[PDB]
Amino acid sequence: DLKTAVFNAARDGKLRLLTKLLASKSKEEVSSLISEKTNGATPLLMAARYGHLDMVEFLLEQCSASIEVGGSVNFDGETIEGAPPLWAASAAGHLKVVQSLLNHGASVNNTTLTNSTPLRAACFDGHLEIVKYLVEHKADLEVSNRHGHTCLMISCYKGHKEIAQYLLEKGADVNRKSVKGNTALHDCAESGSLDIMKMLLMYCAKMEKDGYGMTPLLSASVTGHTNIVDFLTHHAQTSKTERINALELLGATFVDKKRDLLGALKYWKKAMNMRYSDRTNIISKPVPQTLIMAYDYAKEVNSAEELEGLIADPDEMRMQALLIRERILGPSHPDTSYYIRYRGAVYADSGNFKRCINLWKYALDMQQSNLLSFAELFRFSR
Hints:
Blueprint: H1 2-12, H2 15-22, H3 27-34, H4 43-49, H5 53-62, E1 71-75, E2 78-83, H6 85-91, H7 95-103, H8 118-125, H9 128-136, H10 151-157, H11 161-169, H12 184-191, H13 194-202, H14 216-223, H15 226-232, H16 240-256, H17 261-275, H18 304-308, H19 314-328, H20 334-349, H21 353-369, H22 374-377
Antiparallel strand pairs: 1-2
């Protein structure tokens, strides 16, 4: 009844409407009902989420018992659980509300249920002035969400240079690993953020393998960011072999993800030149344990002559992309079985159901030997 009238008045910031419904009851009754969770949220959480500064001041004056209580707020259609007012106000960029809340004693590291801090939410949406204010009020840079993702990591992924720079200036550990072994360098690689990647390397950020065995260089090859790959293949921290495999894998990505055979052949020639650059140290192609029926029993081209006829034979190039991806990413990387299935589907759509079925059987046997489904298809939390 009136509980929801005060909830709405807070949500909408009609302060005179509120002090009307509120001037009746007693100081024991106001606090008892400003603490009432209408729809999973408190009046304070709503006032803060929507930046009603006077409304937040008035509510806190009456009773600060809800200042740390986590409720439910909406951002961009998603509902977040266990969010306290400070987290909501910083996620939404209401710097004035953030200042008010910390004045009234809001805990600066009080997280959501996903262990996202107010600092993390501010880094996600790129609120630099809030990021600075939170850090200057003892926000802990190194508190990561439940996945092990950090404020530095999410800043890199979203390309917020200025925020990434600020966190690094203020001491953020550039070599944190998430639970799946992801580092901020990986986040830069996956987002194409070359400028932020360079910045991280000013801080001697180590290039490392994640859980999937992926260096930042490979991550950029898998997701197709050539600005990162061109940069890292000219970087002394990557060996000749890592450079070749990244170029080769990126070409496979050009085939399967970018549907671009000209581009793919560029990187395969680039990588083949390097395999035969030192005439006395040939980096020969590895040989798999066996030929694969699903792959049409194809072998990776092992010289530059074998590459010259490739563009005229797209099916050969598509089998090359699959051979390369299994060689470099392995059966346990989700992209291997994924692109096997996608290539199978393209054969089904063009009418080659035997090739389709042999590739899907093989994706199934690969998936289930190393222990994104058809039905479904049909760490970056804020």
